[PDB]
Amino acid sequence: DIVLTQSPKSMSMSVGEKVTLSCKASENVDTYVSWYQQRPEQPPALLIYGASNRYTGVPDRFTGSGSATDFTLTISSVQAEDLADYHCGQSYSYPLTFGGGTKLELKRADAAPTVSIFPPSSEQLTSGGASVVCFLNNFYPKDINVKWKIDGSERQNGVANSWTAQDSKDSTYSMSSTLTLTKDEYERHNSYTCEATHKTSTSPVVKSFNRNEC
């Protein structure tokens, strides 16, 4: 069916700014493009319908325009409560379809990640498992690449990463990287490195620990 592409994947802006979100369609959909806003842990809300008609209840700073292919959502003045996910869909052809969504995040000053690594606890080794955990806290922007080196060699198996959404206080992000090994695997190597590389530094941020060190 007609594919709807949303140009802005994730836009970073300040309170009091003007954004313009893009939504393009494959084929003609005339003006049957609706915009939905979706705050965290909340369902979608109708924002603009008929390409330009503002749904009842929606403030003025929201203004949609466009026809048959190129549509836009203009936000006069961005506000805190406007930080959210925006979806647009067409309702002209019937596989009804939605775009991938554009996320709006609050901009802030760059911050380096506070890296922390932890050897597996004896409570876990004692039962045969080996998890090495690494925390990459309160950094900004999102973009970050973590990497595990065991005794100097990279390792991609048994690495589970998890990222938090932008914080509702300091606007930073955070992630934890967990590496999992059998106790046998664990005890044959000695050096464990968690190497982070963030745009806030020309050199990789590294936390390490040698097993032969109490």
């Binding site: 369902p43 934890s176 967990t178 999992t180 060190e213």
Partner: protein, 217 residues
Amino acid sequence: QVKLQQSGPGLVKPSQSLSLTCTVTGYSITSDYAWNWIRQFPGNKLEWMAYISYSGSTTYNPSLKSRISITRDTSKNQFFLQLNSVTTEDTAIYYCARGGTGFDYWGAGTTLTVSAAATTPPSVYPLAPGSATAAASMVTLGCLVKGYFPEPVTVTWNSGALSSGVHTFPAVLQSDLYTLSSSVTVPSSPWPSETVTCNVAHPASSTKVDKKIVPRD
């Protein structure tokens, strides 16, 4: 005014079939409008599944019209969604909605989890510093909560006493079990000299565990 409410099995086994109930209040589903089922995948991606019109018509998304079916009970003012041969690929958030003028009303949506796993309590592991990694003023401690099913898990530090400098990450899948972690950063005054305990609660398995982060050897 208009009010939609979903409900249904929260967890099921692959291959199985089921039905999601959307019970709407403050408007007759025979009155007008189309009544839809839309789902959201992990990543916020939205996908339309099907609708049933007030007149009784039914449309389906061609990619699911082999496994789904929409029916209604105009007496109880409800319309249901039936999914068969459910795959893991179907776990998501399911919404029912009224549409026309774009999708006007939406429900709170209901979470479905397609999994073969069986309810099993979490293993909680204390995460104390590697003896060397800790930049003066602040020391970070952690808590590893692995191998548990299903969601969710409640994690707090010092029964609630500690609230800031805290990080709890979204659970992820390892094998077919969830694993999640949490951290707290405290001044290097407290911790060694003051006990910080991590508390984990897995309602499903009626499990409740406290774990003290003590210095390693």
